[PDB]
Amino acid sequence: RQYYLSKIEELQLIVNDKSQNLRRLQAQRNE
């Protein structure tokens, strides 16, 4: 069960930075 959970725990880091990124791009836009 370990690999199936480590894999989700690295894709979680990538989506996390994407979400912080999408917020910024929304900010650069609305201005």
Partner: protein, 32 residues
């Protein structure tokens, strides 16, 4: 829940990519 978390996360990543692509376009088009 090992599988369940997996598909929601990967779906989120795939969908957040679309938001990036659209926002990247709209920033460009707005600049026009």
């Amino acid at each position: 829940d090992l599988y369940s978390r997996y598909k929601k996360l990967q779906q989120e990543l795939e969908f957040l990519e679309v938001q990036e692509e659209y926002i990247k376009d709209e920033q460009k088009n707005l600049k026009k």
